[PDB]
Amino acid sequence: EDCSNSEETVKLLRFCCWENPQFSSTVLSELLWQVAYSYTYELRPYLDLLLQILLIEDSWQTHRIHNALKGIPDDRDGLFDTIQRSKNHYQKRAYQCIKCMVALFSNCPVAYQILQGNGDLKRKWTWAVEWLGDEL
Amino acid sequence: EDCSNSEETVKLLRFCCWENPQFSSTVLSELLWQVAYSYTYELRPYLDLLLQILLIEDSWQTHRIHNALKGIPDDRDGLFDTIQRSKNHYQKRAYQCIKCMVALFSNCPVAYQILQGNGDLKRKWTWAVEWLGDELERQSNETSNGYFLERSHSARMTLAKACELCP
Hints:
- This is part of a larger assembly, with 2 copies of chain A.
- By secondary structure, chain A is an all-alpha fold.
- In chain A, about 70% of the residues lie in helices and about 0% in strands.
- The first copy, chain A, has helices at about 10-15, 20-35, 45-55, 60-70, 80-85, 90-105, 110-115, 120-135.
- The longest helix of chain A has 17 residues, at about 90-105.
- Chain A is globular and about 40 Å long.
- Chain A starts with 7 loop residues before the first helix and ends with a helix.
- The interface between A and B is small, with 10 and 13 residues.
- Chain A: This is Ubiquitin carboxyl-terminal hydrolase 9X.
- Chain A: Interacts with SMAD4, MARK4, NUAK1 and BIRC5/survivin. Interacts with DCX. Interacts with OTUD4 and USP7; the interaction is direct.
- Chain A: It is found in: Cytoplasm, Cytosol; Cell projection, Growth cone; Cytoplasm, Cytoskeleton, Cilium axoneme.
- It is classed as hydrolase.
């Protein structure tokens, strides 16, 4: 919540999230909370921190992209869910989420084989891209 | 968790749950857990599998229906509990639990005398129908889109069928 823009936090998270299943969910639980229920002008410190949690190439990487796009069920939304919740109002929230996602897919291969290979996430990713265009 | 939508998983559960209190408990416990903590695009298979468990016409049917509508006490798990938590957000999950219940009540005479004959369940069943009525008045609710009740025709029929069940 507080010290997300710094770089001594990314180092602590990437050191503990590494092949720790429960902890990697805790960080995602908190990060998905703030990307959804936090003030619209401060998402970039949180979203940019989310990358270096998804880009950890360990045995749990696939789950992290899974539990960031679908969301941890029945509490925290996902990157797609917050987009739906914010297309009409707080449109800047959904835009900044897409920037994270575009950056993630273009710079993470394993993310591309999860987007390309899971039709539901594939199909939702479509509706996202036109919406960004139409708003422009 | 994994082998859902299969016709052989339900046949095995339906076979083992017959007159088995311990086994039926775990099946209900796991099914209710799956109904609560799972993505809405994979909820219909669990609800449909749950419904087939409740339709087992053995001597534990009333117990199974009680543990599914209410849940194990002091744990706040159960179809009414998950409906209550999902009224505000994830409204698509709350509706699908109702849609399963309508199919249960209108097709299980044993699980209609449990409703008609228990007061709080009728209150809880009532609170569902106005919530569904109010939510709809404001397609194919499996798309896992924005989580807002899309009027569609599945919902309108479900609301219509729910209303007649109310005494």
